[PDB]
Ligand binder design. Structure first.
Ligand SMILES: [Mg+2]
Ligand SMILES: [Mg+2]
Ligand SMILES: [Mg+2]
Ligand SMILES: [Mg+2]
Ligand SMILES: [Mg+2]
Lengths: 773, 774
DNA sequence: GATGACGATT
DNA sequence: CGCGGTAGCAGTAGG
DNA sequence: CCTACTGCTAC
DNA sequence: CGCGAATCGTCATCC
């Protein structure tokens, strides 16, 4: 056969056709690895080869067949989309598969062009979890007998290899979970190197030779059982409610008996693979696509922010998107393709009416797209550059707080935090709408002034509502509003029953048969609207032309209707929820919300209203003010002790001439003999992520270095006057922190209110400059 | 008209069709900006709009029509030019007629638009190549249309520089004129430079300004007697005319020509070809043809210099797209990331026949195979690069890099103009690319021959040393530089002075088979097999071809038809330059060389032999060893002086109680009164790129920071005793440097031999490790 | 039935 | 997870 | 002769 | 300088 991305095995379809394997890989780069391994003259005699092995590309993610089939009774009818899929239709041609056959007898199977198919997917969760599950679901849906009789197989490859400086042999892992456990449980990985294999093509020469030296001893066969049929419907059927049930809990790990049994005979039940590999993907896809309720960010957008703060710290000089993306993927350990990261960066910096972000993390330099095309008319990442919206970020995400956040560790190293805790509840302040596994995500930004009133009343005791709001929250009866935002909207909003709705604006003119549309409902792109209207034969009966005179950010569509306005009212219908002229031009939109978010420790959580998201975020922000303030108190005490000792050394440096002492170790003794405290200076000047316990526990690992590396410029008494000034100001700050801790209703309430005013100033300023500053 | 990537102008094809403009842009990103400008209702009615403007993208670089017409019959377009989606799409939108000549005002009034406006990027690729190609399209078919102003241009800046406070930036239209302007400035410490790689890079307040002044920034092209010949020079089928034209630099326009252009906004095509198109072509030669000193193009030099920076603290491996981003930022890369990621991958490939016998990087992952010519490499997201630091440390000494002349991009230091490696790298690799005017092709010279020549030139004790120096003086060959055979299991033969490459085969009459066990030099396996079966004459005697090649090796099974072996010998003649199986299976290959390189001064140079490239490289490497040694002498003198002062303070630190002085000034007064020299410590500790005289004049004009920033631990007698040794080792090294300078046959000859031995050991190690060094 | 959307992924 | 179009020069080949 | 490949560095 | 095939979960509309 002549199929694209297919390299035939020599004996395929011939006398020895049942001795051949079809290696299905994720893409061309993975095919290049398989080609290299099958072309080894020094792997023999059991080394695989093109005598009995073929290659075919799966084209990345294949199509879910279970969701494109209609049952018919006297029959399973395949849809167009499934019938005309090039990748799957190529696999059917290469294998000589027949949808009418059920392949139960070894006669019936011996007319196939290959003996089996071996899924050589990448070990990333997308590969073994998603793509492999889709392939298993394809065969189970059409030819379940082939799974019973061992036709569907798998090649196991590592996902992580960690090498030691000594040992010539690495430690190999097949799951990020099991490596991360191994990494934290290790003492330190100081002389190791960790390598994550996002695709097959990442394996090096001597690594490829090892994998093919043990090829068939890494090939596993799939098996079927009664439990499989229902599980395939759970994970890949049409009812997402089951996914909502399955994804409430984490994966149930394999027992020591199941693991040992599987590896001894190299057989994997389809039910176990769906429960472990496929499910682990499904939970992971939720973490990628569903944002956290604390900061309203996905993992990519949080890595992009954390990387942005690092990259745009020294300079904040603009950098092109493709350059910034590489920095993010390197310093924040990003295990996926650069295409999806570069696009996320652009979507994170877009600022137009209807955009996802009312308060974008970055400033966009260049053509970043327009409302009229929904932001998809942005320039390629090679031209446009981003730049941190540093005034907003510095106020919304305080730098002091970031040391105290819990952090994700990828490849054995610290990466982005598990979550940020912004000063205002950012998860309800922006727009969002994307699907995921099991749950959909959709948010419509809440009004800024309502958020301020509510949050400020919770913290400001002098606010009239302070008694009363806390009493209301304990009994879950809400008194203050959280209404949809009206910013960047030239229309109005209405609330009917259980939904809020969005309304455009229009103007009629009787002198010359025109309707001028000057606003569309929230998040509606102009071009698609015009297209969608002219695609109506009902309406276009009465329109002769539609002309678009909108400006870059505004909307102005002139619609030339003979006297037909009367019919429109008759042909359509007028209610208290929608004018007929507003039915004629679809100027109405329903604010459907799907408030599903991710938990701090991990998992899905469903919210019923925007109020609960605010109430759930407040304790984390309340508690975080304690740690900063508590830690500042602890560090200030130590810095005072250190500076006081240094000023005492400067006062004793002239008589206590260090010039005469022989060694570094001697000089450390004479400072101890003079009553100087041994101090762990590096931790005092730069505590970084040190917890309070670590602070007090390691502050005594002294070395007297804080004196010995003191420069001569510090001996000058003006530098010493600045030190004594610094001591007095730190001693003054210490007493304000003690008061700020003993504050009501909780430590740091006044600090929270100050920073709330600071964030508001940044938003007001950004809003007046179109987030250009 | 329903043309792809075309947004119809409202009055196109109507009464007011001659008032409508077609904006031709470089691509989609540029189209989106024009859309933003055409859709401003506050740009004043002055601003243009979609009432009278259309957009179409040119698809990047358009097709050269002048080389796809026979036209002698008038204007006969070949299939490829007839079926060009971009060009025939512009003909569809405008309603152009190849049979019309557009002399009269009927014929121009039968056009769907009034003119076309080239809104190309201001980089030399845009206005020089693409616009010149577009002008050549209209000039070739409808010269009258250019006479009457149908072809136009929108002028846009290429660089903008902003000063703190000042609101209006200074704008440039040529990188050369900015680079000149930058050097004459005092310092760019309070400026910011910005390069516009495409139109889409302009920001909001910039786009609003450009469209506010749209009508007065559009220029019209005009024709003259000299234009027709110049269009044939630059875009015709005689490369010899390009070879003559590109010998010379661009001749800048006089203030009279500049004033005339800007006063009426009309540009002669001859002038545009002479400045913009030529400036591109000269630049393209520098981009694509490598320098004869280091054998690198401009991009590969940026990739090396960027690699040394990236992999300096940590030779930790990085993905190609990550490293590519690093290079484009730190080395100022003004082009697309696609060709940069590709150049990086080709720079790290190591397989038989690959361009590089001595790759700059180590490749971790699938970096491609001999069988597909390296086009089966993984996507840049999977594979990783890593500096071949042992090779880089020896071939490109770090000390030398401080002394090279450097390129300055955006007013800042980038990659060097050229490296001067320890061995002549331009004759040590394989190369083959076209360019403007000249082609480039080299076949790597044998390493043992390279060593013999270079070692004899430097080692006075070599028997051939006296005799070799006589040979360079008269350009006569005494020693051989034969093509390299490394990673080649075939044969090489010499006829006249041309080398040929031979595969290897084994015949088998027991079962009518020819087994090919090697292909000629640089011949890719897959393309070779196809080339054989696409000839029906050869396939007459072939029933099957089977490919059993291994990772680097070759084993192609060729099965013949029953009684063909006797008939092949007659049908395929047996000469002394190939027998009848090497003609039959095309197992011979000629090492054609095109030794054209780029000069240090910025021009092309043609060489006649590989000897001349070696002879031309030797002076640069000889002088660099001198310059290096002289500067070390200068720095060592200063560091000794500085350390001597520091140790004298440590012995005087007890009496000179800095504790009692109030400010640094007092401290500066009291040390000077004690005879301490004011020193420019930063320059003495870190000379960086300071020239020797530049060094000599400022190192003794600084202050007392070398004293004031001394920490207390240095006052300990152990720390001052370590300094006194450090001074003593520098004083010994100073006397050794004076010996190396007083050396024969030239200063630093013995060091050159040392570093040659270091380079060979590194190459031997890489060759034993498959260029993994692990 | 058939055909669209998003963000973060292959 | 992949995909093309274009220039430039000069060799080869096939037709 | 015409037309089609092939490379690297670009759009 | 540009091009595409796929998933997922609700929502929409045209015939
Ligand atoms: Mg993958
Ligand atoms: Mg992780
Ligand atoms: Mg003293
Ligand atoms: Mg450009
Ligand atoms: Mg330059």
């Amino acid at each position: 056969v002549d199929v694209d991305k297919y390299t035939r095995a020599r004996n395929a379809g011939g006398k020895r056709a049942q001795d051949c394997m079809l290696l299905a890989a994720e893409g061309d780069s993975a095919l290049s690895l398989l080609r290299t391994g099958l072309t080894l003259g020094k792997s023999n005699p059991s080394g695989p080869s093109f005598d009995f092995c073929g290659m075919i590309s799966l084209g990345g993610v294949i199509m879910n067949a279970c969701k494109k089939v209609t049952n018919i009774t006297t029959i399973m009818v395949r849809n167009e989309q499934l019938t005309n899929n090039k990748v799957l239709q190529g696999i059917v041609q290469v294998l000589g598969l027949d949808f009418n056959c059920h392949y139960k007898t070894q006669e019936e199977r011996a007319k196939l062009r290959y003996g089996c198919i071996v899924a050589c997917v990448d070990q990333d969760l997308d590969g073994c979890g998603k793509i492999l599950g889709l392939l298993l679901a394809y065969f189970h849906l059409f030819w379940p007998q082939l799974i019973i009789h061992g036709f569907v197989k798998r090649l196991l490859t590592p996902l992580i290899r960690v090498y030691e400086k000594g040992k010539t042999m690495p430690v190999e892992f097949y799951y990020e979970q099991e490596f991360d456990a191994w990494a934290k449980k290790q003492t330190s990985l100081v002389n190791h190197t960790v390598k994550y294999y996002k695709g097959l093509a990442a394996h090096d020469t001597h690594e490829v030779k090892s994998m093919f030296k043990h090829f068939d001893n890494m090939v596993y066969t799939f098996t079927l059982d009664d439990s499989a049929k229902e599980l395939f419907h759970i994970y890949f059927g049409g009812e997402s409610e089951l996914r909502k049930r399955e994804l409430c809990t984490g994966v149930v790990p394999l027992t020591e008996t199941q693991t040992q049994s599987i590896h001894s005979v190299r057989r994997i039940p389809c039910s176990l693979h769906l429960q472990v590999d496929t499910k682990a993907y499904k939970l992971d896809a939720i973490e990628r696509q569903i944002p956290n309720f604390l900061d309203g960010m996905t993992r990519a957008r949080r890595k992009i922010l954390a990387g942005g703060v690092k990259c745009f710290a020294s300079n904040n000089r603009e950098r092109k998107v493709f350059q910034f993306g590489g920095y993010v993927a390197d310093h924040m350990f990003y295990h996926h393709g650069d295409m999806s990261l570069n696009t996320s960066i652009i979507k994170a910096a877009q600022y137009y009416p209807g955009s996802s972000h009312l308060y974008p993390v970055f400033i966009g330099i260049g053509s970043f797209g327009s409302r009229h095309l929904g932001g998809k008319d942005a320039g390629s990442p090679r031209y446009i550059s981003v730049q941190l919206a540093s005034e907003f970020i510095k106020t919304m995400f305080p730098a002091e707080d970031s040391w105290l956040l819990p952090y994700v560790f990828e490849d054995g190293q610290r990466a982005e935090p598990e979550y940020y805790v912004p000063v205002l509840p950012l998860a309800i302040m922006e727009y969002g709408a994307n699907p995921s596994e099991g749950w959909k995500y959709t948010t419509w930004a809440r009004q800024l002034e309502d958020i301020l009133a509510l949050v400020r009343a919770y913290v400001d005791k002098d606010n009239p509502k302070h008694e009363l709001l806390h009493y209301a929250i304990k009994h879950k009866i809400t008194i203050l509003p959280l209404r949809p935002s009206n910013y960047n909207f030239k229309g109005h909003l209405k609330r009917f029953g259980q939904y809020y709705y969005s309304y455009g604006t229009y103007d009629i003119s009787e002198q010359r048969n025109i309707i001028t549309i000057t606003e569309l409902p929230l998040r509606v792109p102009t071009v698609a609207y015009i297209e969608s209207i002219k695609k109506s034969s009902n309406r276009m009966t009465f329109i002769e032309e539609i002309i678009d005179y909108s400006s870059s950010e505004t909307i102005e569509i002139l619609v030339k209707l003979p006297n037909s306005l009367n019919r429109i009212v008759e042909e359509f219908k007028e209610t208290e929820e929608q004018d007929s002229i507003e039915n004629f031009l679809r100027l109405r939109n329903c604010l459907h919300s799907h408030l599903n978010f991710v938990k701090p420790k991990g998992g899905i959580i469903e919210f019923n209203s925007y109020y609960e998201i605010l109430y759930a975020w407040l304790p984390y922000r309340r508690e975080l003010y304690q740690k900063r303030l508590m830690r500042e108190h602890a560090v200030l005490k130590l810095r005072i002790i250190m500076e006081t000792a240094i000023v005492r050394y400067i006062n004793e440096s002239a008589e206590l001439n260090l010039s005469h002492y022989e060694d570094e170790k001697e000089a450390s003794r004479i400072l101890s003999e003079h009553g100087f405290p041994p101090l762990n200076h590096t931790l005092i000047i730069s505590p970084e992520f040190a917890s309070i316990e670590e602070l007090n526990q390691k502050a005594l690992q002294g070395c007297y270095t804080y004196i010995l590396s003191l420069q001569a410029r510090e001996l000058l008494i003006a530098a010493k006057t600045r030190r004594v000034e610094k001591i007095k100001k730190m001693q003054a700050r210490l007493d304000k922190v003690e008061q700020l801790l003993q504050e009501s209703p909780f430590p740091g309430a006044s600090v929270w209110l100050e920073e709330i005013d600071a964030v508001e100033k940044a938003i007001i300023k950004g809003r007046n400059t179109q987030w250009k500053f």
